[PDB]
């Protein structure tokens, strides 16, 4: 009998309740005050142009059919009640494949306040598309969107709202960051209208401003690229007569850059435009190829095949000595121009 009081309340709420019809159908728009508490910002898969996000996706709307009076002001209920009531058919416009976790039970809470207000929260892992323009990659920053709205109901039928000030209606947990190669600088939220083949729809946009960390790509790509440029420019300080040795330097170094250039792309989508690393690779490719062409030029004028001993001996090539200082200055000037151009953008 102690719980029979609340059983008779829940039975009354669903008596004659048609969960196919939205609140205020034909009477008013259904305002759904939404909020997102990002328990953890999942990893970003640049290869698939998508990111994962774990959220306590909160939705609140007024349903006058669920007004009740009783010894409690807020009925805290399990998910089983949620499927019995109308809930917004919210979906994510750029959602690729999302999971509504239900271990051990459906991770959904449904609180019904005495005035009819509902608080319908669910735990989701949303895998959303992030259209990524990798022009400045890896020194790039992306405003990955998280758009959601009603799938069926037009703006005249349901409209979405932020439950607090828009700046204060998307909260990220303090330790909730599963990003490896990114920093969540923050989020900006906006609400607009999207015109579709079926009608006008309200779309709540959230732009998570992610800035990539170059720490991985500096170790993985730039240092091997730079040390390959410096490995090639070691050949200048070797005697010209050592034809196999300097030849091994150029072919191995050029071979290394081809491996590195192929390797770098493999972690990226197969975009048809050059990224900022491609130009760095291309210039580094130019600097190792020039260092083999430089040796080929030196080998052209290498009038003798025997190095110094202890009977004219080949002099040190003026191309080498100029290349000794020119190639590390030109390579250094390129880095200053390259790094300054990309690092100082905003």
């Amino acid at each position: 009998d102690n719980t029979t009081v609340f059983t008779r309340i829940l039975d009354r709420l669903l008596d004659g309740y048609d969960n196919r019809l939205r609140p205020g159908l034909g009477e008013r728009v259904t305002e759904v005050k939404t909020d997102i508490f990002v328990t953890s910002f999942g990893p970003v898969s640049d290869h698939d142009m998508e990111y994962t996000i774990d959220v306590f996706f909160r939705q609140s709307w007024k349903d006058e059919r669920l007004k009740f009076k009783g010894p409690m002001t807020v009925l805290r209920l399990n998910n089983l009640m949620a499927s019995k009531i109308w809930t917004p058919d919210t979906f994510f416009h750029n959602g690729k494949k999302s999971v509504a976790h239900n271990m051990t039970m459906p991770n959904k809470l449904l609180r019904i306040t005495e005035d009819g207000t509902l608080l319908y929260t669910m735990r989701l892992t949303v895998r959303a598309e992030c259209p990524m323009h990798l022009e400045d990659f890896p020194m790039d920053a992306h405003a990955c969107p998280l758009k959601f709205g009603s799938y069926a109901y037009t703006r005249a039928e349901v409209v979405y709202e932020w439950t607090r000030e828009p700046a204060r209606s998307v909260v990220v947990a303090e330790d909730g960051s599963r990003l490896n190669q990114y920093d969540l600088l923050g989020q900006t939220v906006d609400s607009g209208i999207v015109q579709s083949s079926t009608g006008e729809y309200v779309v709540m946009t959230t732009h998570f401003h992610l800035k990539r960390k170059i720490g991985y790509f500096v170790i993985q790509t730039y240092l091997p690229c730079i040390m390959t440029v410096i490995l090639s420019q070691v050949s200048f300080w070797l005697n010209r007569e050592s034809v196999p040795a300097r030849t091994v330097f150029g072919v191995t170094t050029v071979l290394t850059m081809t491996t590195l250039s192929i390797s770098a792309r493999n972690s990226l989508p197969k975009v048809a435009y050059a990224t900022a690393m491609d130009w760095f690779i291309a210039v580094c490719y130019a600097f190792v190829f020039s260092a083999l062409i430089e040796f080929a030029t030196v080998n052209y004028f290498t009038k003798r095949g025997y190095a110094w001993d202890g009977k004219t001996f080949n002099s040190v090539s003026k191309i080498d000595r100029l290349s000794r200082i020119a190639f590390p200055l030109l390579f250094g000037i390129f880095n200053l121009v390259y790094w300054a151009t990309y690092l100082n953008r905003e």
């Epitope: 007024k62 700046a167 900006t188 609400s191």
Partner: antibody
């Protein structure tokens, strides 16, 4: 129709306290928040705070934190603002602004001049 | 908070002449920007919300647009009743209205 009717003109001296009310009509009070706004003579509008009428939660501006208190009567539709330790700088006209959405302030109050001298 | 700055503090546009009123935000506000009309001894009256939309029961002469941190209200041809102060607000965060802009003939 909707119409917000505030208290009216007030005359006071520094150090006293004044309470100004903001009645609401034409819509359910608990549905929407109520913001309070100050505007000195020929100056930009300034936000004091807002009160959630349902649960009576309040948020205040840092400039007016501790200077004013926001209270609400759910039974009779009215939002109350009380000022204490008044000074000459607080002589201004005060408005109460409904917030229909997170986009705009739908209906504003008539305006309550305040005089301190 | 976020401060809104009306660049032209005052104007002298003639009746029946196009006029532009600029509004700037110190940082992002999205589309959450609105314009209100403050006649002397009258409370503000909303004209433009969402930085592009127009409140119901408003003349079509009031046209406003803008992007993030750059918002403009343009009146194609002002009338006698259109002479008043204009305030641009932002509700992307705790609300903060900008300095008024007034018109003269």
């Amino acid at each position: 129709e909707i119409q917000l009717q505030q208290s009216g003109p007030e005359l006071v001296k520094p150090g006293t306290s004044v309470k100004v009310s903001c009645k609401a009509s034409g819509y359910s009070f608990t549905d929407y928040n109520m913001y309070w706004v100050k505007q000195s003579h020929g100056k930009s509008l300034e936000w004091i705070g807002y009160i959630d009428p349902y649960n009576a939660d309040t948020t205040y501006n840092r400039e007016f934190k501790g200077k004013a208190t926001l209270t609400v009567d759910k039974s009779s539709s009215t939002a109350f603002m009380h000022l204490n330790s008044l000074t000459s700088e607080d002589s201004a006209v005060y408005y109460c602004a409904r917030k229909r959405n997170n986009f705009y302030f739908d209906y504003w109050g008539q305006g309550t001049p305040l005089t301190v001298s | 908070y976020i401060v809104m700055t009306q660049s032209p503090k005052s104007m002298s546009m003639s009746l029946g002449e196009r006029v532009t009123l600029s509004c700037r935000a110190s940082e992002y506000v999205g589309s959450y920007v609105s314009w209100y009309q403050q006649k002397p001894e009258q409370s503000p009256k909303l004209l433009i919300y969402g930085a592009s939309n127009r409140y119901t029961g408003v003349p079509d002469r009031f046209a406003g647009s803008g992007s993030a941190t750059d918002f403009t209200l343009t009146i194609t041809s002002v009338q006698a009743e259109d002479l008043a102060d204009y305030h641009c607000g932002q509700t992307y965060n705790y609300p903060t209205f900008g300095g008024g802009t007034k018109l003269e003939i």
